[PDB]
Write a protein that binds this ligand. Structure first.
Ligand SMILES: CC[C@H](Nc1nc(NCc2cccnc2)c2ncn(C(C)C)c2n1)[C@@H](C)O
Length: 292
C-alpha cells in the first residue's frame, strides 16, 4: 500500500486485536515508530486521541485513513508486560517494580479518565515497558471506536481474563471502573505469576470470578440481579480471603486489590483514589532487569 512507502518495516511486532503491528522507521525522518495497520465516526474519535497525551500513555503520533486502511502511528516501546511476565516466570517480578508499574498505570488511567476516555480492554499484551522503568497503556480509545470483537482480525480469541463482571453480565454503559477491574487482575497476575481469572468462555470467566470473589448479589452489587445476562441459576459460591488469592502481597496491597475488584462499579476505587492509597507510601521507580 502507498502509505507504507513512508516507512521501512523493520520487523513484525505482532498481531493486535484489530490489525498487524510493525516496528518501522520513517524513511525520511528516521524516527522509529510502531505502525498499526487496520483493514476497514471511528476516524473522528481516534483522531481526538492525539491530544490525549500523558507519560504513561503510549503516544499516538498520527492517524491516517488511506485506501480502506487505517494506520495508527505510535511511539515504539521495546517490550510488553505479557512477555516480561513470561520471562520473569522463575523469579517473579520484584515487588517494588510491581508497585512502580501499578502506580504508573494508575496515573495513566487517572489522566485518561479525567478526560472521560476509557480503555475497555486492558491486558498485559497492551501494557508496554521501556528500559527506564516506565510502563504505558497502549490502544487507549480503540475499543470505543471499533468495539471489542470475539476474535481478532486473525481469528485469535480475544482474552476474557481481564474483563469486568458488568461487561460479562451485559451492561450497556461502560464506566471508567472497567479499567480499574482489568488493572486489578493484572496486578494480581504480576504478584502471583498466574492469571487470576483465566476463563475460556464467558461463563467460565464469570464463574471463575464468582468462585474467588463470591457470587454477587444485591447486597454487594445493587441491581446486579437485573442485569441482562444475570441468571438466578448461577451457582452460589462463597467469597475467598485475599490472603489466599494473592500471597505474598502485603496488607496494603491486598486492601487496594480488593478495592479494585469490588463488584459494584460505583464502589470500585477510582484511579485518583488509588494513587492516594497507603500501598504507594513507599513507591519508587526501579530499573527492570531487561535484555533487548
Ligand atoms: C501486537 C500487539 C500490540 N503490541 C505492541 N507492542 C509494542 N512493543 C512491544 C514489543 C516490541 C517488539 C517485540 N515484542 C514486543 C508496541 N510498541 C508500540 N506499539 C503500538 C502499536 C501501541 C506496540 N504494540 C498492542 C496492541 O498490544
Amino acid at each position: 500500500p502507498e502509505f507504507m512507502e513512508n516507512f521501512q518495516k523493520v520487523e513484525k511486532i505482532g498481531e493486535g486485536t484489530y490489525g498487524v503491528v510493525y516496528k518501522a522507521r520513517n524513511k525520511l525522518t528516521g524516527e522509529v515508530v510502531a505502525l498499526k495497520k487496520i483493514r476497514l465516526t471511528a476516524i473522528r474519535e481516534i483522531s481526538l486521541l492525539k491530544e490525549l497525551n500523558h507519560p504513561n500513555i503510549v503516544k499516538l503520533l498520527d492517524v491516517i485513513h488511506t485506501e480502506n486502511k487505517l494506520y495508527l502511528v505510535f511511539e515504539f516501546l521495546h517490550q510488553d508486560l505479557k512477555k516480561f511476565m513470561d520471562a520473569s516466570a522463575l523469579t517473579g517480578i520484584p515487588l517494588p517494580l510491581i508497585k512502580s508499574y501499578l502506580f504508573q498505570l494508575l496515573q495513566g488511567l487517572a489522566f485518561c479518565h479525567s478526560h472521560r476516555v476509557l480503555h475497555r480492554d486492558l491486558k498485559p499484551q497492551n501494557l508496554l515497558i521501556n528500559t527506564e522503568g516506565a510502563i504505558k497503556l497502549a490502544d487507549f480509545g480503540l475499543a470505543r471506536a471499533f468495539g471489542v470483537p470475539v476474535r481478532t482480525y486473525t481469528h485469535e480469541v480475544v482474552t476474557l481474563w481481564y474483563r469486568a463482571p458488568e461487561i460479562l453480565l451485559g451492561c450497556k454503559y461502560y464506566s471508567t471502573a472497567v479499567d480499574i477491574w482489568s488493572l486489578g487482575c493484572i496486578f494480581a497476575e504480576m504478584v502471583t505469576r498466574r492469571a487470576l481469572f483465566p476463563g475460556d468462555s464467558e461463563i467460565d470467566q464469570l464463574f471463575r470470578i464468582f468462585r474467588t470473589l463470591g457470587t454477587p448479589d444485591e447486597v454487594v452489587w445493587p441491581g446486579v440481579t437485573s442485569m441482562p445476562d444475570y441468571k438466578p441459576s448461577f451457582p452460589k459460591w462463597a467469597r475467598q480471603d485475599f490472603s489466599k488469592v494473592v500471597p505474598p502481597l502485603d496488607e496494603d496491597g491486598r486492601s487496594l486489590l480488593s478495592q479494585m475488584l469490588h463488584y459494584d462499579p460505583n464502589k470500585r476505587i477510582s484511579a485518583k483514589a488509588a494513587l492516594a492509597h497507603p500501598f504507594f507510601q513507599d513507591v519508587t521507580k526501579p530499573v527492570p532487569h531487561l535484555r533487548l
